Amino acid sequence: MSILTRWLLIPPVNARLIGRYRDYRRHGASAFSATLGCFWMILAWIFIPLEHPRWQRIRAEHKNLYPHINASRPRPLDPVRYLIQTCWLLIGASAFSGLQNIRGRYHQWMNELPERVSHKTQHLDELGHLSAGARRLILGIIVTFSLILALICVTQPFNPLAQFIFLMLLWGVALIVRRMPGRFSALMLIVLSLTVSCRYIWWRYTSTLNWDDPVSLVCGLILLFAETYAWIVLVLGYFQVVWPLNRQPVPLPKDMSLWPSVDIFVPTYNEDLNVVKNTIYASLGIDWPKDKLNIWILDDGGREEFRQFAQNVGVKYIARTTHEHAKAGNINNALKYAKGEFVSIFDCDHVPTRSFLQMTMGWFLKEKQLAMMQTPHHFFSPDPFERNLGRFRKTPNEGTLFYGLVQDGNDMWDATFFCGSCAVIRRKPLDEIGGIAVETVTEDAHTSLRLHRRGYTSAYMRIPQAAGLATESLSAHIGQRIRWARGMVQIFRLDNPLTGKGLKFAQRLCYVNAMFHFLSGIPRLIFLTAPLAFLLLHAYIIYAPALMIALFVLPHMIHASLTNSKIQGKYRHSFWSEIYETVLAWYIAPPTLVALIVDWVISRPYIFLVLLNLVGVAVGIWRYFYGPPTEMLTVVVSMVWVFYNLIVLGGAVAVSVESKQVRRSHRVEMTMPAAIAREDGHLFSCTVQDFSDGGLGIKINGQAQILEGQKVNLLLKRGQQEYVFPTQVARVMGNEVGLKLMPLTTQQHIDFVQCTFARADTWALWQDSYPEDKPLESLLDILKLGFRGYRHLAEFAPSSVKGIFRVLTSLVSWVVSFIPRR
Amino acid sequence: PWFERLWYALANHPILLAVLAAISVILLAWVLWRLLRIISRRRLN
Amino acid sequence: SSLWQYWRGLSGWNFYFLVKFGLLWAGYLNFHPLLNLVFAAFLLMPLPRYSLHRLRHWIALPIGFALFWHDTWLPGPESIMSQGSQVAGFSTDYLIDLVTRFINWQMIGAIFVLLVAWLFLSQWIRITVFVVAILLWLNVLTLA
Amino acid sequence: SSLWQYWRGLSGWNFYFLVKFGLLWAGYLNFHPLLNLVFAAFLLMPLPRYSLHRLRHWIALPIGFALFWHDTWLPGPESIMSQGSQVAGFSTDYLIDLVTRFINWQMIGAIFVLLVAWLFLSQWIRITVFVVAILLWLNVLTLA
Amino acid sequence: SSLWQYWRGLSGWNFYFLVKFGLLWAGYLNFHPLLNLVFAAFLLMPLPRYSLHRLRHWIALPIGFALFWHDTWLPGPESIMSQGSQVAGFSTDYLIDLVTRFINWQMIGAIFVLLVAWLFLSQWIRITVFVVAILLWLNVLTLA
Ligand SMILES: Nc1nc2c(ncn2[C@@H]2O[C@@H]3COP(=O)(O)O[C@H]4[C@@H](O)[C@H](n5cnc6c(=O)[nH]c(N)nc65)O[C@@H]4COP(=O)(O)O[C@H]3[C@H]2O)c(=O)[nH]1
Ligand SMILES: Nc1nc2c(ncn2[C@@H]2O[C@@H]3COP(=O)(O)O[C@H]4[C@@H](O)[C@H](n5cnc6c(=O)[nH]c(N)nc65)O[C@@H]4COP(=O)(O)O[C@H]3[C@H]2O)c(=O)[nH]1
C-alpha cells in the first residue's frame, strides 16, 4: 500500500498520509473504512478551510458539536452524518444577560400578580356578603350565563383555519395560566380542559362516526367508547383532586395528662426479623410518654426470634395458633388484647418517625367524630420501575402522585381511605364497625368505607413520616397492584359506594374514581390495537380528514397533559402513567372482566403487541406509495400512532429487566454530619454520602492516613448530643471509605436508628430534590427507555424472533446514528 | 334553525367565541372557588 | 478579528421581515427585493464594538420604517403634507369612519399570532438563516 | 517547517474575482479568461518574504485597478488626458448632474450584498479554490 | 551505497518538459522524441557527487538550450550565419516585434500558469513519474 502512495505522493506528504492512515487503523478501523475516510478528509481539506481560526475552534470542539461522529474512527457514510449535523447546526440556534434578566423579571411579575391581587382583595375584603335570596339568584343566573357561553364554545362548527386559531388561543390561555401559583389557577385549568374535552367528544359523537360500512362502524364505536371512558375517568379525577385540603397538624395540649394511649400493631406473616428490627427500634424512639404507648409485634410464623426480640427491646409480643383472614384476622386478634384508646397499624417495613404520634393526634382531640388519619408512604429503596431502568431518585414512585396529591384532595370530600398501614384509628368507632374488614383482600378501603357510612369523618396529613422498603421485583409490584384491583372489585361486587345512605355524593364519586383505574385495562388494549384497523384491515374508524383529527384530538391531549402537569407537578412525570398502565393492563383486566360477567409469563403480551405493531408499520410503509395521494395523511397519522404504541411497549419491556442485587441493606443516600476520631486527640470531619441497615459511607476530605486494619471511633451527633458506636473500616478504595455495622444490643440499635433512619427531616429535602416534571426531558428519556427494552428483548427472546428483533434494533441504531444531536 | 342562525353568526367567529369562553371559564372558576372555600372551612373547623 | 463573532443574527428584525413576507403574500405589497436584501445585509453586517452595533440598530430603525412605508400601497408624503390641514379641518365623524375603515381586525389577529409564533420559533430555531434564504430566493426569482 | 504558509490563497482578491464574475454574468464586462487566470497565478504564486508579499500586493494594487478599469468598457485614459481641457471648458454643474445620473445603485447594492456574502462564506466555503475553478472552466470554454 | 537516495526525480527539468508539452500542443515546436528522450536519459543518470551534479547542471543548461532551440521551426544556424551582417545593423525593435508576432503572449501566459501549477503540484504529487510516463508515451507514439 505504501509503494503506490510513494509512487503517487512526495515523501513528505506521503509520510503525512501514511501517519494519518495508521492513526485511523490503530482505532480498529478497517482498510476500506480508513481508505474512504482518507479520501473524505482530503476532499474536505480541499473545500473547507480547516486552517481558518473558526475551523480550528470547530475541530477543537469536534466532540460536543458532533457527538455521534468519532473523529478517530472513520466509518462508511460519514459525509451523510456530517451534512445532516451541519445543516442542523445552521438551522439550530446557539448581551444575553440583559435579556435573561428581563425575562426573569417578567416571570416574577407574572407569578406575583396573583399575590398582589390577593393582598388587594384581602385588605379590601368587604364574595358572599349580600342578602341570601339575592345572592342565590345572582349565583344561579351567573352560572347559567357561564354555562351557556361554554355550550356555545363547545358545539360551534369550525373550518380548518378557525379550528387551528381557536386551538392556538386556548393553548396560550393554558400556558399563561399554568405559570400561576395558587389553587384558583387549578380550577381555571380544570374548567378550561373540561370545555375543550367536551368540544372534542361532541365533535367525535356528532361529525366523525362512519355510517357507510357495517365493518367500520362497530370498530368506531369501540374506539369512541374507549375515549368516552377515558374522558369520564379524567373528569372524575379532576373532581377528586380539585382542591387539596392541605390539612395542618394540630398542636397537642401542653399538659401530658389528657393525652391518650396509642397501641401500635406491627403484623408479620413471613417477613424476616431483619426488616422489623428497624421499625421496632424507631418505634421505641416515638416522642410519646412511655406509660401511654404500646408497641406490639404479631407473628404468624410462630417464630421465637420475635419473642426474644420483643422481650429484650421492651415491647410486647403476641402470637396466634390459628391463622384465619390473614392480616385482618391477625390485627383483630391483636385488638382483642389492646387496652388502649387508639390503634395505629404500622407495616412490617415502614419505619415510624419520632414526631409521628404528636404531628397527627391533635385532630383526634379537636374533631370529636374523627375515626381515621392516614399518613403518606415514602419508599427509600428503588421500586421495580427505578432499579431496572436506572431511575433512582430521578423519577418518583408510582404512589408518589397518589400519596402527595390525590388523598389530600380526597380529604376535602372526606374519602381518604385507609392505605394498608401507617394510620391512626380511634378505637371507639373501630369497636362499632367490628374491626378490620375480613371479607375481601383489600381490608383497608372496606374498613374506611364502613367507617364513613356511619358518619364518622376521616383525615389525612401530607408530611412523609414513614419510610419503607419498596417492591423488590416487578412481579411482586404487579401482585400488589393486582391485589388492590381485585380488592376494590370485590368491594364493588359486595358493597356499591354509589348506592347507599348517609354518604355525600362526593364520597361515592371518590370511591368509584378510585375504582376506575382498575378497569382501565380494556381501554388501554383498545387504544394499542386501534391503528390495526386501517393499516391491517381497511376501516375508517374516524370518518374525518387527517387535519381535523389532528385539530380536535390534539387539544384534548395537550390540555389534559398541561393541566395534570400543573396540578400533579412534582409527583408524576408525564407519559410514565401510560407506561405503568400498560404494564398493568394485561393482568388486572382478566379478573375484572370475569367479575363483570425474557419471561414466559410476565412479558408475553408485550411480545404479542410488538409483533402486531411491527406488522402494522410494515403494511403502512406499503400503503404510503401504493395509496392514492389523497389517502396519504391518514397513513401518516396512523403510523405516528403506531410509533407511539411502539415506544409504550418498548418501555413496558424495559421495566422487566430484573438487575443484579447483592446489597443486603438498601442504601438511603442522604447527607448527614459525622466525625471520626483516632487515638491522637485530633478530630477529622467527613462527608457522609449514604447509610444502610448494617453499614455507612463516608468520603474523607483529604484522606489523611488510615488503613484496612486500623480502629477508628465514629462519632454521630444529633441535636446537641454526641453518640459513640464501634465501627470497622470495610472498604478503602481512595476517597470512598467502607464501613460495616456489627450486630448490637437493644439500646445501641435504638440510638443508631434514631441517628440515621428515623429523622423527620430527610424526606423533605428529598422531595426538594425531585426533578421538575418536564415533557421534553421525558421525550428522549422515554425514547431511550423503549430502545433499551427493545434491545433487551432482542437479547432474551426466542431465536426465530431473536433474529427479527436483532435486525430491527440494528436498523434503529443505524438510523439514530444519522439523527442530529444538540 | 335558530341554532344554525347563531352558528352562522359565529361560524367564521372563533376569536370572539374563544374570548367569551375565557370569560365563562373565569366566572366558573370563581364560583367553584367560592363553593370550595366555603366547604373547606365548613370541613376543617 | 480571528473569527468575527459579530454575526449575531437579525434578532428582532426577524419579525420585521416576516411581517413584510406576510403582507406580500396577502397581496397588499409592492415588494422591493433589492432594497430588502440590502437592508438585511445592513442589519447583518459585522461590527466590532457593541456601541457601533447599537448605533447601527438605531439608525436602521427609521430607514426600516421608511422602507416598509415605501413597500406598501399607501400614498406618499406629498399627499400627506398637502392634506394634513384638510384632515385637521375635517369633522370628527369622518375621521372616525376613516379610522374604522382603515383597521382590519383580521390583519391585527394575523400579525399578533405571527408575533407569538416568532417568539416561540426564535426560542427554538434560528430565524435569520430562513429570512435571508427567502430574501435570496425572491431576488433570484425576480431578476431571472 | 511551515512552508505551506507561503501558499495562502487570494483572500482579499476573492472579492475582486467574485465581483468580476458577477459583472460578466450580467453582461456588463468584456472578459479575458487567460489574463484573469494569469493574474490568479500571480496571486497564488508565493514570494520568499512576508515583506516581499506585501510588496507584491502593493505592486498588484495598480495592476488590479488597471485590469478592472480596462476590463470595463470605459474609454482609454489617454483620451481623458487629451480632452481634459475640453472637459474643463464645459460647465461643471452639467458634469456633476451627469455623474450623479450615471451611477447605478442596483449594481452598488448587489456589490455590497456580495461583499457581505463573501465575508460570511469565507468559513464554510474556500473562495480561492472556487474562484480558480470557475476561472479554469471559463478558460477551457474560451479555448475549445 | 545508498544510490536510491539520489532518485529525487527529474526536478528542475520538469518545467522544461512541461513547457515542451505545452508548445507541442500549440504546435510551435518540432519535437525530437529521440533527441529529447536522450536528454531525459542523460538527466536520468544518478551520480552521488554533488560537485559532479553541479557540473552536470553546467553541461545540461547548454544542452537544454540547444535542444529547445533545435526543436523549434525557427531558421537554422546557416541562415543566421549568412545574414548576421545584415540583421545586426537593424534595430532591435523590429527583432522584438517579429518575436512577439511569431510567439504570442498566449504562450507566455500558459507558461506562467503552468509554472504555478507545477510548483504547487510538486508539493503534493510526484511530478517526475508522470512526466517520464508521458515522455515515454510520446516516444512510443512517434515510433508507430
Ligand atoms: N465491593 C463493594 N464495593 C462497593 C460497596 N459499596 C460501594 N462500593 C463501590 O462503590 C461503587 C458504588 O456505586 P453506586 O454509586 O452505588 O452505583 C452503583 C449501583 O447503581 C450499581 N451497582 C453495582 N453493583 C451493585 C450491587 O451489588 N447492588 C446494587 N443494588 N447496585 C449495584 O452500579 C453502580 C456502579 O457500582 P460499581 O461499579 O460496583 O462501583 C461501586 C463499588 O466499586 C460494597 O458494599 N462492596
Ligand atoms: N455504603 C457502603 N457500605 C459498605 C461499603 N463497603 C462495605 N460496606 C458494608 O460492608 C458490607 C460488606 O461489603 P463487602 O465486604 O464489600 O462485600 C460486598 C461486596 O462483595 C458486594 N457488593 C455490595 N454492594 C456492591 C456494590 O455496589 N459493588 C460491588 N462491586 N460489590 C458490591 O456484596 C457484599 C455485601 O455488601 P453489602 O450487602 O452492601 O454489605 C456491605 C455494607 O454494609 C461501601 O463502600 N459503602
Residue numbers in the entry:
A (entry chain A): 1 to 94, 105 to 136, 140 to 610, 631 to 855
B (entry chain B): 26 to 70
C (entry chain D), D (entry chain C), E (entry chain G): 12 to 155
Share the article's original sentences:
Bacterial cellulosic polymers constitute a prevalent class of biofilm matrix exopolysaccharides that are synthesized by several types of bacterial cellulose secretion (Bcs) systems, which include conserved cyclic diguanylate (c-di-GMP)-dependent cellulose synthase modules together with diverse accessory subunits. In E. coli, the biogenesis of phosphoethanolamine (pEtN)-modified cellulose relies on the BcsRQABEFG macrocomplex, encompassing inner-membrane and cytosolic subunits, and an outer membrane porin, BcsC. Here we present cryo-EM structures of the E. coli Bcs macrocomplex positioning all seven BcsRQABEFG partners and multiple c-di-GMP-binding sites.
We show that the Bcs macrocomplex contains a single BcsA synthase, which associates in the membrane with hexameric BcsB on one side and a trimeric BcsG pEtN-transferase complex on the other. Indeed, using local refinement to resolve the more dynamically associated pEtN-transferase, we show here that BcsANTD adopts an amphipathic fold and recruits three copies of the BcsG pEtN-transferase whose transmembrane N-terminal domains are tightly packed between BcsATMD and the sixth BcsB protomer of the crown, whereas the C-terminal catalytic BcsG modules remain unresolved in the structures. The BcsA N-terminus folds into a W-shaped series of amphipathic α–helices whose connecting loops coordinate the BcsG protomers via conserved amino acid motifs in an otherwise weakly conserved primary structure. The first and second BcsB copies engage in contacts with the BcsA synthase, where the C-terminal TA of BcsB1 fits in a groove formed by BcsA TMα1–3 and is further encased by BcsANTD to complete the membrane export module, while BcsB2-TA engages in limited hydrophobic contacts with the loop connecting BcsA TMα3 and TMα4 at the periplasmic side of the inner membrane. Interestingly, in BcsG the amphipathic helical loops point outwards relative to the crown’s lumen, where BcsB’s stacked carbohydrate-binding domains are proposed to form the polysaccharide extrusion path. This suggests major conformational gymnastics of the catalytic C-terminal domains for pEtN extraction and transfer onto the nascent cellulosic polymer, and could potentially explain the lack of resolved BcsGCTD-corresponding regions in the averaged electron density maps. Consistent with our earlier but indirect BACTH results, we reveal here that the E. coli-like BcsA synthases have evolved a specific N-terminal amphipathic domain, whose W-shaped fold recruits three copies of the BcsG pEtN-transferase. On the other side of the β-barrel, an intercalated c-di-GMP dimer is found coordinated between the arginines from the canonical R696RxxR motif in the N-proximal PilZ domain linker, the active site gating loop is unstructured, and the active site is substrate-accessible.
